[PDB]
Amino acid sequence: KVDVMIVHAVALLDELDKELNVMAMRVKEWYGWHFPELGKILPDNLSYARVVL
Amino acid sequence: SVRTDAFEDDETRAAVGIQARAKLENNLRLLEGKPLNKGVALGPNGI
Amino acid sequence: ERSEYRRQLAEYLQNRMKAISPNMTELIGALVGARLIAHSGSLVNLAKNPGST
Amino acid sequence: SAAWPKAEDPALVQELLDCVQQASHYRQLKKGANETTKSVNRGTSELVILAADTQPLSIVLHIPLICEEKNVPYVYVPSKVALGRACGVSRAVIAVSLTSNEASDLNSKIRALRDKVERLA
């Protein structure tokens, strides 16, 4: 099996976690105006996005 | 192990990594679970 | 949706690294070994390097 | 198998291991597969012996590549224990590399020795 999709795959995992982190904090503020306490009593962005939904 | 994978069911293809896990984790617990330096005990009077 | 794409990308890279180097997966795991593969570039070019490297 | 430069037990192995021991006494000797690999990749290496008694031989199959790249002669002896006490290590040395300097009779012995290795390959 081939290794170029290993190196591109983990590069896409790095940019994936980066862009998901900035988009995650983006919904932290972007809902944080209407309801500020959710980021304080909820640190995690995954459960944050689920409870915003 | 990566040299074995790179120059040649999966528990015969993975025949180096399991031996290195057993030796390397056994080696871990013999490193960590070690006694401290031997110290004298003194009584109430310094005896 | 990007969190779900993180989950199935992680299962992709885990199963793929199990198919490419099972010795690595049964030492340190797909992510860390995949990042070693990504640093040196490839599997033979990781194998040409000594243990201190 | 993959040991196509197999050294012959009629005293070519013996001259290899003897020159291993003399280079060990002149400190011209990088022992073990990793330090051998460092000497070949850094290009200090003048000759390199491996051991075909390796239990998985894949763990020393990687250095004939970089020895073909650096154009240094490699040859296999059939016992890592004989290579190990040929070095003087008290463990099994699996692959050894031996360098040279500007002026030594050891460098002359390396020259004649890889002349014989060139008669193999």
Add this chain to the structure above:
Amino acid sequence: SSLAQQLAQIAANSRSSFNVKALKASHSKSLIWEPRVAVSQTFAEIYSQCYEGFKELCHLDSRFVPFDATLFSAQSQEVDRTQMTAEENAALDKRVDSFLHLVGSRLRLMPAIKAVEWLIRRFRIHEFNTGTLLATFLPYHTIPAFVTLLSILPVQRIPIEYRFLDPYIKSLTPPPRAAIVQQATNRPDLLSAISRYTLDSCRAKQEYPGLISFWGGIMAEAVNGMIDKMRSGRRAIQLENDHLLLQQIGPVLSEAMVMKDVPGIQIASYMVVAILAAKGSLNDNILTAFMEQLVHGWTVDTLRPGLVCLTMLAQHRSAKQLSGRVAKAVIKVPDLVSSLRDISKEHQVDKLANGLVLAFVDR
């Protein structure tokens, strides 16, 4: 500093408290809580917390009803330890020791640690019974509760047996059984103290397989190290060392081999005897003593490893034929030759069978 030494010995002898710094620093010790939370805590509160835990342990087992009647009674909130005559402190240490033998199996559970935390925070078992409390937490010497014990434990009321724990009290980390076993080799005071515990919990049928396996482990590696010490090669020294080794270990094995109702410690003593005949070159009369007692302390549940010990003992015995009672109970073994073939697949059985069949010629 003669008066300083005599008053220092009075102060380390002093089992009570007389200033408020030591009421607060004495009431501060606890397994569960923190010091700042444990200082300002009355005894009805701790009795509520614990006796919730002892309700739980009284659901989980059944032999705790008399300790509901005495130790975890509603009246035992108001029993100061240091205003009690020595007959009362002796009887209370009897009930404390029997309760602690009883608890010592379930000790990884929070109801057990709640009940033990009432014994510590009122009866001060960490200040009056440290040999039995170190002897009961000492099998669980890897869990963190043993390190909370090593942080409430008074450093100079600890038996000289157990004083190897001093750098482990000093730096709060659990000790290894390398250290436990090493001081069990050098101090016979320690190795007897473990075996005085384990045999005391088995006369009242309160054993558990972590206690059995822990004790048999320490006797195993400890008697290995002792034999490696006691070897000298000088003939009278190794004779005298063999006698000293038999005088140290002797009575422990002499009850453990015969203790039929605890087949665990019966098998552990089989194990140490097998180590002892294997590595230690003991005399033929000693080995006939081990074989005859092994033969007497005999069970259906300990048939199969006891036969292996007969093969070891008979194999390292220098004389040729066996002696009497061994041949009689091996007659009473049901599947003799088949069991000895299954043993002979992994051991050597031929000197045992030779001593048997030669004794049958001599019957």
Add this chain to the structure above:
Amino acid sequence: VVVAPQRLAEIFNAAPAFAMPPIEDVFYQVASLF
């Protein structure tokens, strides 16, 4: 029988007191070492 003590220590290193194999099996490990 010469047996280095570290192999019997290796019999008693893992699975500390609880979760150890039962001592019929541990005794088979010990007597099989001897």
